[PDB]
Design a protein around this motif. Structure first.
Motif, short mmCIF file in Angstrom:
data_model
loop_
_atom_site.label_atom_id
_atom_site.label_comp_id
_atom_site.label_asym_id
_atom_site.label_seq_id
_atom_site.Cartn_x
_atom_site.Cartn_y
_atom_site.Cartn_z
N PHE B 70 -3.37 -16.51 -6.18
CA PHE B 70 -3.00 -15.22 -6.77
C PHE B 70 -1.49 -15.09 -6.67
O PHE B 70 -0.97 -14.50 -5.71
CB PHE B 70 -3.69 -14.06 -6.06
N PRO B 71 -0.75 -15.63 -7.63
CA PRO B 71 0.71 -15.57 -7.55
C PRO B 71 1.22 -14.17 -7.85
O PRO B 71 0.57 -13.38 -8.52
CB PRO B 71 1.16 -16.56 -8.63
N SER B 78 -4.52 -6.92 -9.52
CA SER B 78 -5.66 -6.16 -9.04
C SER B 78 -5.52 -5.89 -7.54
O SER B 78 -4.82 -6.62 -6.83
CB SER B 78 -6.94 -6.94 -9.34
N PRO B 79 -6.18 -4.85 -7.02
CA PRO B 79 -6.18 -4.65 -5.57
C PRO B 79 -6.89 -5.74 -4.79
O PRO B 79 -6.55 -5.96 -3.62
CB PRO B 79 -6.89 -3.30 -5.41
N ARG B 80 -7.77 -6.51 -5.43
CA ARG B 80 -8.34 -7.69 -4.79
C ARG B 80 -7.28 -8.76 -4.62
O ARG B 80 -7.24 -9.44 -3.59
CB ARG B 80 -9.48 -8.23 -5.64
N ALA B 81 -6.30 -8.77 -5.51
CA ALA B 81 -5.26 -9.77 -5.43
C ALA B 81 -4.19 -9.34 -4.46
O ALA B 81 -3.62 -10.18 -3.75
CB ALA B 81 -4.65 -10.02 -6.81
N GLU B 82 -3.95 -8.03 -4.34
CA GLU B 82 -2.94 -7.60 -3.39
C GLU B 82 -3.46 -7.70 -1.96
O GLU B 82 -2.72 -8.10 -1.05
CB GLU B 82 -2.50 -6.18 -3.71
N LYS B 83 -4.77 -7.50 -1.77
CA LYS B 83 -5.31 -7.68 -0.43
C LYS B 83 -5.45 -9.15 -0.08
O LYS B 83 -5.27 -9.53 1.09
CB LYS B 83 -6.66 -6.97 -0.33
N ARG B 85 -3.34 -11.44 -1.12
CA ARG B 85 -2.00 -11.91 -0.81
C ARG B 85 -1.45 -11.28 0.47
O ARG B 85 -0.42 -11.73 0.97
CB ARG B 85 -1.07 -11.64 -1.99
N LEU B 86 -2.13 -10.27 1.01
CA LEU B 86 -1.69 -9.69 2.27
C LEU B 86 -2.30 -10.40 3.48
O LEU B 86 -1.59 -10.75 4.44
CB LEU B 86 -2.03 -8.20 2.32
N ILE B 115 -12.86 -7.71 0.52
CA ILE B 115 -12.22 -7.37 -0.74
C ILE B 115 -13.00 -6.32 -1.53
O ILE B 115 -12.42 -5.58 -2.33
CB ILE B 115 -11.99 -8.64 -1.56
N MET D 69 5.81 -11.48 0.17
CA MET D 69 4.69 -11.49 -0.75
C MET D 69 4.71 -10.31 -1.70
O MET D 69 3.94 -10.31 -2.67
CB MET D 69 3.38 -11.51 0.03
N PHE D 70 5.55 -9.31 -1.45
CA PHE D 70 5.70 -8.15 -2.32
C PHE D 70 7.18 -7.93 -2.55
O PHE D 70 7.82 -7.13 -1.86
CB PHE D 70 5.06 -6.91 -1.70
N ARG D 80 0.38 0.45 -1.78
CA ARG D 80 0.01 -0.63 -0.89
C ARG D 80 1.19 -1.57 -0.70
O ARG D 80 1.47 -2.00 0.44
CB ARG D 80 -1.17 -1.39 -1.48
N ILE D 115 -3.71 -0.45 5.48
CA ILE D 115 -3.10 -0.04 4.22
C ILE D 115 -4.00 0.89 3.41
O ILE D 115 -3.50 1.75 2.69
CB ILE D 115 -2.72 -1.29 3.42
N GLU H 82 -12.52 -13.85 -10.21
CA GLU H 82 -11.58 -13.70 -9.11
C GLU H 82 -12.23 -13.88 -7.74
O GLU H 82 -11.58 -14.42 -6.84
CB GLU H 82 -10.90 -12.33 -9.16
N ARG H 85 -12.62 -17.75 -7.39
CA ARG H 85 -11.36 -18.37 -7.05
C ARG H 85 -10.93 -18.03 -5.64
O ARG H 85 -10.16 -18.78 -5.04
CB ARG H 85 -10.29 -17.97 -8.06
#
Lengths: 222, 184, 73, 184, 184, 222, 221, 184
Positions: B70-71, B78-83, B85-86, B115, D69-70, D80, D115, H82, H85
């Motif tokens: 998830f670059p 999406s919030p699934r991608a921000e979580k 990447r966290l 997620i 990452m952000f 977030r 978060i 997603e 992945r």
């Protein structure tokens, strides 16, 4: 070039024994130095014949011959601290052998190992083999369950164990099999969750499992 | 003189040499500039070096992380991608902080990923951690397991001592002597 | 009720944003040609209408609006 | 004369040298101008140096922080990503302030990232901290666990003394003598 | 004459020299015009100076502030990004006013941050402070807790005397004599 | 190139003592000056051999030798205020050695330290050791809990202490450990969240009852 | 050259002992000096043979021989504070050995240590070994539970320990394992979380924990 | 020297040579330039080499991952595309972490995927794991199964010890000696 100079610089880990059948045995002490010595003899930079022996490999090899020519024998382990006079730990309270056929066995075991000069047979007591196994299992504060039957005991360690009770229960078993063998006493570590996970049950000789507030299941007496 | 691997980079070549050198075969690393490194062995050591390439799965593939799937260069996130990447940057910072302890050479931490709790009105579940470690030998590694549990317990919201599993082990024996050139 | 009109009006602007990009990118390809005078609304509305149902719009915001309130599905 | 690593960084070459000089093998830091540094060891000391490169995982990766990452150059910024970019600057400033105490050489602080708790209608949970430290030796490091808890107890909203875990240790024995060149 | 650092800053090279000069090794600061300064050390002292670079984590990173994660040139400023840029300048002005007291050489203040009370209907909570200070020696540093606590207690709306945490210490012994050249 | 000239300019913070085993000892004072003198002997700008000693680490070194050849011995500290004649503080009330086996201990302690001339053994009283630790802890107005047992005493300071009580306790323990050492009496400063700083009570039918000191503490809603 | 000149600059952290089988022994004192001295002999800048010994892995080597040729033997530790005359700490109340076979065990240990000249064997009581371990565990104010049995004793440390007590415990167990070793008395520090943090409960004879205003928990004794 | 294969890969040719050298027939890694690698065997060994190619299904296909057919390059992505992945990067990072244990040469981890629970009216099911491993010989591999289930247990939300199945095995015999040319 000689064999003790064809190995590495540290001439302390290996020990070259002159065999009696016109050979030359090198005695490593683990499986990494066994492949270190087998690579030299396999690439072929030595003229004569030579073999690489070990502790666990030779103690597994001699039990295949003994499981055909001497079945129903009660023994523990062959010790190779001095590789010219090995010690054969035999049981005392389980054999039917007199003093003559023990010398016959000590000569036929000498003919299986050409690097050895004499095989010493000592009779270890049978109760201290499980006394050390129980007393070493109680100092680690481990829960256990001993099962006694003829010709071998069994210690079962089950339930949900934490990370200290796994690391303490593995360093003891590997330090006990190294000095006694897994012929007599067997440890059974089994990491599993609790049986009847979230169910209320009524144990003892007339049992049921409450699958729900209004559902009774009647298996084997829990 | 026979070649067995070409085009390898620097980190791949230094882990192919370190594998072959402990099994009594000697390798040679040859640079080629733009095209990368190359590793050549002798002629009697080729049958064994191919066997350890096959067994040990060499060359090593690059280590993967969740933050690469998830670059941060996407226009929408999406919030699934921000979580995702966290949590993948927290579990990298925790294993970079475990190597600063007394005796640890390597470590690897895993976090349970949640997620689907944020997308709908479900409450979140508890969070689970799991660690690995490699210690210097001569150390009493039974009492070293309580400091990693105390360090890992309050680095998150609310964990227990039953949701943390630490599996650690002493390092292997040191390889210090040269392999040895085969005579012919 | 005043917190729901507030929470609805800033969702509808985010929804408004892609469409403005569409009818600003189809109205500028006519002026690159010799089409300075033709009306772009009669070209904008089919190219905006066949994209929203092909990308499954009305089942994407009907899910994403009920996920705020209840444990749907 | 045999090359181990090349194309390194200035801060990456002094860690490989600081690791190899601890184990009685020399190294040479050769600059190449634009291509970076390079480290060469002798041929009797090539078999041990590849083993310590593989064991100690050299060269070191750069240290990861949560604000990377952000990035701030984004066109949209969810709350977030604003809370994660805020907590990732508080745990960098607190570990920069811990290194100015009497006797501390290095430190590392972790904050519990929560978060979605302030977003949801459920009240936000308590915040947990955790710290590591390396002290100058000769220090009574059992009494200094209360000054660090007093320092970072009042730097947040509502922390307890049970939600702070400090794990600290003394530094290693000093390496001051030269390694020594291999004589043949 | 073996270099170990180059491309450094003006305030970075003065932090490397003052660390090496404390441990009986002398260094040379060499300017290079546009490419920064560079520090070279003698050959018998190269083994010790690499060990103190690794131990003290030199060269020093630039000090971070919370107002750098939220730059003022952005077109959209949140209430969270305005409350954080307010507190990140009150935190710097308080530690700039702590240094003008009678006996303080350095200081560092930490204000507790509140973010998720403004967007929702949750009320704000009490603000917590924390401080560090370095005092000139020969001073009674036990009686000077009440002057810093009295000065900090009336710079915010609602703080208590048990919500302020002051940890302070005296400075080290002075380094006045030269290191000395290594003869052979 | 003399050793006192290879050190710094100010020749009053070091002291070079001649040895009996043909080796010169440099007696530094703290940890910062020990590495200032170890850098000189490490870079090798001196011909013969020399060693650097210290008050803090020659007392840690001599206790490794002492708890192997003289176990179950009660002592406090070795003071090196005059390094050619140290004083060994022995406990009077907890050992029954005679005069001759105290002179044998004083000669075997002398052969361990080649820079000393004669180790002087003085017998310190055991009541004033725990007496000056209580009388110096009542003077700073700190809460404490004295726990007596056989062969030692411990003082526990719990509670949510403020920033002045932490500074006075830490400033006092470091001034007591230098004089007596932590072999007999030990301090237990620890912070936790309860407004009653260590003490606890239970209430029934007659007033309050002072409870016994224990490990469980009641967290304070306040 | 000589072996003590091929080592580091400071000739104090290494002791070179002459053997008896025409070999040389270097006696390091920790693992960092053991790997410092093994790189010299491994790279090969010395003509004759040499070995590097230690304190730990030499106490580990002669317990492998001593669990084959002398099993059921109760001992503690082999001390190498001076490497030419080591001290063997044997137990007093658990051995069945007379005056003669102690001398034969001394002669069979001298053959196992070629760098030594004699081995001094002393006998220590098992009461002071378990007494110093309980008095030191009481002086640090740690919660503990003693479990006595034949041929060993174990101390269990459980509870929700804070970050001060897990450092006071580690500084005591590390200071005790160096002297006596783990042959007799074993420490078991395992930490668990507490249930009664915010709960109300009744302790004593009839004990229960109220997990809720409508929920009782009766723990097993 | 009749030819067998061509157009292969660097890793596809090292598996063909490793298979043929196990069965006492030699091979030649002839480079073809820009085409690739080519394996040529002798004329008496041609019948056996064709039969072992047909039996062992050589050349090896590239190993597949689940995140290879849901690429992150598309402008829109379903939650189904997603979660597959995310789980495909977790089952690779756990495989990379299992190889750093004591004795493991190779491993493979499978996770139960979730498809229908995103849109159906059912809650998502529990997670099931499956692992394989190859251990270095001399290992008591009945005790290793409790160190893998403990590590894999709390690396997820909630799995049981009944939902984890570990099937591991010791490695095969070593191949060190040369095959031998046919006497013609």
């Amino acid at each position: 070039a000689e064999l003790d100079s064809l190995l590495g610089q540290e001439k302390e880990r290996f020990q070259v024994l002159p065999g009696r059948d016109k050979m030359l045995y090198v005695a490593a002490q683990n499986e990494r130095d066994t492949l270190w010595a087998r690579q030299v003899l396999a690439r072929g930079d030595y003229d004569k014949n030579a073999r690489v022996i070990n502790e666990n490999e030779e103690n597994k090899r001699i039990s295949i011959w003994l499981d055909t020519y001497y079945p129903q024998l009660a023994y523990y382990r062959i010790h190779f601290d001095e590789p010219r006079k090995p010690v054969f730990w035999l049981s005392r309270q389980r054999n039917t052998m007199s003093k003559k056929e023990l010398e016959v066995l000590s000569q036929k075991l000498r003919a299986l190992m050409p690097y050895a000069d004499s095989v010493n047979i000592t009779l270890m007591d049978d109760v201290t083999a499980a006394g050390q196994a129980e007393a070493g299992l109680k100092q680690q504060a481990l829960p256990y369950s001993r099962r006694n039957h003829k010709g071998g005991v069994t210690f079962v360690i089950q339930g949900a164990l934490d990370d200290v009770e796994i690391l303490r229960a593995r360093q003891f078993v590997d330090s006990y099999y190294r000095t006694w063998g897994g012929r007599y006493v067997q440890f059974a570590i089994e990491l599993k969750d609790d049986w009847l996970k979230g169910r209320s049950f009524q144990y003892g000789a007339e049992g049921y499992i409450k699958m729900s507030p209004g559902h009774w299941y009647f298996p084997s007496p829990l | 003189d026979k070649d067995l691997l070409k085009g390898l980079d620097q980190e791949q070549a230094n882990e192919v040499i370190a594998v072959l050198q402990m099994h009594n075969i000697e390798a040679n690393k040859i640079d080629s500039g733009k095209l990368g490194y190359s590793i050549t062995v002798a002629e009697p050591d080729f049958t064994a070096a191919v066997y350890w390439i096959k067994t040990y799965q060499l060359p090593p593939r690059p280590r993967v992380e969740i933050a690469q799937m998830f670059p941060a260069d996407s226009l929408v996130s999406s919030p699934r991608a921000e979580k995702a990447r966290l949590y993948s940057a927290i579990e990298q910072r925790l294993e970079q902080s475990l190597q600063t302890m007394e005796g640890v050479l390597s470590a690897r931490v895993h976090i349970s990923y949640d997620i689907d709790a944020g997308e709908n009105g479900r409450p979140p579940k508890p969070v689970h951690l799991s660690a690995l470690a490699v210690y210097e030998r001569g150390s009493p590694l039974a009492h070293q397991i309580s400091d990693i549990k105390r360090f890992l317990k309050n680095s998150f919201a609310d964990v227990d001592y039953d949701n943390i599993s630490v599996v650690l082990s002493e390092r292997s024996d040191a390889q210090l002597q040269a392999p040895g050139t085969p005579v012919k | 009720a005043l917190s729901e009109i507030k929470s609805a009006f800033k969702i509808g602007f985010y929804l408004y944003l892609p469409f403005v990009v569409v009818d600003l990118v189809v109205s500028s390809v006519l002026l690159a040609l010799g089409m300075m005078m033709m009306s772009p609304v009669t070209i904008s509305t089919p190219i905006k209408l066949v994209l929203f149902v092909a990308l499954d719009g009305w089942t994407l915001l009907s899910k994403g609006l009920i996920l705020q309130y209840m444990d749907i599905a």
